[PDB]
Structure 1
Amino acid sequence: QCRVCSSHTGLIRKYGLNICRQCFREKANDIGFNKFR
């Protein structure tokens, strides 16, 4: 499940981060992923 919002769904299980796409899009800027292009 997504280690942020109790969600079985949306999971980005890649690289061992396991945040669903909705929360990972928000935490993207704090993780290191920024908008270039």
Structure 2
Amino acid sequence: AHENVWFSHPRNFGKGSRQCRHCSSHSGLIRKYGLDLCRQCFREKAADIGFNKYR
């Protein structure tokens, strides 16, 4: 049947199992502390989250 084949491959334990919260890209994600933001999106949102540059 159609619905049995669609999206059947298991998307856990991989790059395709995770995505950015903001833009849903699979590349360069930051998973530390459950951030789940790709590194560019985190560079944009760090001030909002509470991450600041000191040294």
Q: Across the two proteins, how many residue pairs are aligned to each other?
A: 37
Provide TM-score, normalisation by structure 2.
0.61
Gaps of 5+ in 2: 1-18
Gaps of 5+ in 1: none
Q: What percent of counterpart residues are identical?
A: 84
For residue 11 of structure 1, what is the amino acid of its counterpart? L
Cα deviation, residue 35, structure 1? 2.1
The higher relative CO (CA closer than 8 Å, separation ≥ 6) is in 1
**RMSD value over aligned CA atoms?**
0.8
Provide TM-score, normalisation by structure 1.
0.85
Larger Rg: 2
